[PDB]
Ligand SMILES: O=P(O)(O)OC[C@H]1O[C@H](O)[C@H](O)[C@@H](O)[C@@H]1O
């Protein structure tokens with residue numbers, strides 16, 4: 395039986411994408427860059443803050459100093475943080491709260507493996523802090539996804555090997571990161587946005603303890 399579940403945040407526990415979009419668009423418009431639209435924003439899904447800014451500057455062809463780069467990222471984050479102040483428990487994705495309750499009741503470890511440095515605050519906004527045994531720190535791994543580092547850290551943060559864990563993800567890079575850690579991925583969304591050779595559910599209402607247990611047994615030899 396698996397000993398831990400390693401949760402991505404954005405697209406699994408909640409959606410942060412519209413907030414990130416408005417913030418990046420505002421930043422792009424502030425510096426006079428065209429191209430940051432809803433189509434482009436899909437490329438930034440699951441991507442780190444710094445890698446996201448770099449992609450926007452390549453709309454381009456914009457060069458900036460290392461300190462200018464840091465200031466731009468700080469500006470966008472400051473705006474993003476103002477906007478997520480009204481995140482609430484109503485923003486928890488379907489099925490996720492009951493899954494967390496059931497994992498906790500069965501003494502299965504719960505860890506966050508999100509790229510977001512705003513993860514702890516978001517979990518607090520959603521009243522989920524108490525469920526999480528640990529939060530892997532993005533600022534102390536990287537290697538961003540698809541590197542397995544954040545999932546390895548999340549597993550180790552709760553005293554388990556990735557091989558003893560399930561990872562939940564909504565992105566290609568995240569699914570690959572789970573695989574390369576040794577944990578078992580279960581993706582949410584469309585297969586073309588996730589990857590191959592994995593169990594996939596169309597939405598998070600399918601993430602039940604019963605289903606995770608069944609999938610676990612299916613993937614043991
Ligand atoms: O800027 P942060 O709050 O540290 O978030 C970092 C990243 O977290 C997630 O992975 C989102 O999907 C990204 O769109 C976001 O850029």
Ligand code: BEF
Pocket residue numbers: 402403404405440507508509510
């Ligand atoms: F929160 Be995950 F990095 F989409």
Ligand SMILES: [Mg+2]
Pocket residue numbers: 402403404405406440563564565568
């Ligand atoms: Mg995600």
Ligand code: NA
Pocket residue numbers: 480482484
């Ligand atoms: Na609301």
